[PDB]
Amino acid sequence: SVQTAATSWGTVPSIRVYTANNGKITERCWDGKGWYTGAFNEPGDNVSVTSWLVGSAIHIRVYASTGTTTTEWCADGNGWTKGAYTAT
Amino acid sequence: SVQTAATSWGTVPSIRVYTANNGKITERCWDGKGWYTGAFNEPGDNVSVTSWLVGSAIHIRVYASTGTTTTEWCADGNGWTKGAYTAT
Amino acid sequence: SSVQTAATSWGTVPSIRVYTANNGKITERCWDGKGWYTGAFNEPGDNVSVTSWLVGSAIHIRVYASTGTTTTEWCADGNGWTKGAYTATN
Numbered sequence: 711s712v713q714t715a716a717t718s719w720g721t722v723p724s725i726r727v728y729t730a731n732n733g734k735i736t737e738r739c740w741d742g743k744g745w746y747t748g749a750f751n752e753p754g755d756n757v758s759v760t761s762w763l764v765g766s767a768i769h770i771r772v773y774a775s776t777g778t779t780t781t782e783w784c785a786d787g788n789g790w791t792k793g794a795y796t797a798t
Numbered sequence: 799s800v801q802t803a804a805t806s807w808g809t810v811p812s813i814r815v816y817t818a819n820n821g822k823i824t825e826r827c828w829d830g831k832g833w834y835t836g837a838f839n840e841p842g843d844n845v846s847v848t849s850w851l852v853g854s855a856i857h858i859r860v861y862a863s864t865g866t867t868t869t870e871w872c873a874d875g876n877g878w879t880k881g882a883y884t885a886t
Numbered sequence: 887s888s889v890q891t892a893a894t895s896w897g898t899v900p901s902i903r904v905y906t907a908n909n910g911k912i913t914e915r916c917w918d919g920k921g922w923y924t925g926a927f928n929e930p931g932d933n934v935s936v937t938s939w940l941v942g943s944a945i946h947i948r949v950y951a952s953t954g955t956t957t958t959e960w961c962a963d964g965n966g967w968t969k970g971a972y973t974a975t976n
């Protein structure tokens with residue numbers, strides 16, 4: 711079975727749903743006007759997500775794992791960047 | 799092992815915990831006064847959840863997956879509060 | 887297979903907590919603005935979820951750790967991590 715993770719923000723709301731399927735994580739997006747495919751596409755067998763607002767600006771962190779390696783992906787308004795997270 | 803997803807809201811808080819076990823997802827609930835089994839019962843091998851407030855009203859989305867098929871389930875509302883009635 | 891994670895965050899700094907189940911043990915990595923560090927949480931589990939809420943400026947965290955058909959709730963309220971009253975069934 712695929713594995714999903716979800717976040718949301720605001721009152722509209724916006725929702726982002728990440729799905730790990732066959733070693734790849736993809737993103738479906740809701741901003742009030744229908745589901746669409748988001749920009750996020752990265753390798754992983756497992757996904758988690760959290761997000762927070764700074765005023766009206768959304769920040770998202772997606773944790774993608776394959777084997778024992780977890781990579782953090784960051785959305786801070788300009789598209790996705792690798793974060794500093796290490797699992798240790 | 800069973801797989802869970804959790805969400806919470808307010809400052810009481812209210813918590814909802816969803817558990818996928820043997821292809822069924824069930825819901826346990828906390829609103830300050832003990833754990834109880836919720837109405838949510840739907841098929842799934844994997845679950846995620848998110849929730850947001852609009853004023854006092856909570857809105858919940860549960861993402862239930864079996865195979866490659868993810869179904870979104872939706873609920874919302876206002877929990878129990880004392881009303882204006884007086885016997886005057 | 888792959889490790890399994892859960893994440894929560896609060897405030898605007900923000901603070902982030904990332905729980906990882908790896909080979910039957912869940913550990914915690916923490917961000918409070920100044921670098922990632924290993925947290926106090928360390929308990930058994932193959933699967934993990936988490937939620938948290940603020941009461942004013944006080945964070946409260948609940949981690950749901952599952953092994954087999956047993957899910958244990960762990961509570962962070964300022965007294966270390968304690969076992970909560972959650973059970974999966976009546």
Ligand SMILES: C[C@@H]1O[C@@H](O)[C@@H](O)[C@H](O)[C@@H]1O
Binds near residue numbers: 725740859
């Ligand atoms: C916030 C939205 O709520 C309903 O409109 C659903 O049909 C959508 O899929 C979304 O969850």
Ligand SMILES: C[C@@H]1O[C@@H](O)[C@@H](O)[C@H](O)[C@@H]1O
Binds near residue numbers: 726739747749768
């Ligand atoms: C907040 C951002 O919203 C859309 O632009 C998506 O395409 C990105 O992947 C991200 O989720």
Ligand SMILES: C[C@@H]1O[C@@H](O)[C@@H](O)[C@H](O)[C@@H]1O
Binds near residue numbers: 771784794
């Ligand atoms: C909130 C922080 O944002 C960026 O600085 C990342 O590189 C960190 O790992 C963290 O996610």
Ligand SMILES: C[C@@H]1O[C@@H](O)[C@@H](O)[C@H](O)[C@@H]1O
Binds near residue numbers: 903914916924925962
């Ligand atoms: C909120 C707390 O932050 C750090 O003190 C961690 O070591 C604890 O495990 C908890 O996450």
Ligand SMILES: C[C@@H]1O[C@@H](O)[C@@H](O)[C@H](O)[C@@H]1O
Binds near residue numbers: 961
């Ligand atoms: C919010 C509540 O906090 C404690 O009372 C736990 O024992 C409960 O199970 C619940 O998590």
Ligand SMILES: C[C@@H]1O[C@H](O)[C@@H](O)[C@H](O)[C@@H]1O
Binds near residue numbers: 825827835837856873
């Ligand atoms: C918010 C709602 O609380 C109720 O008591 C539950 O039975 C519903 O399934 C839902 O979680």
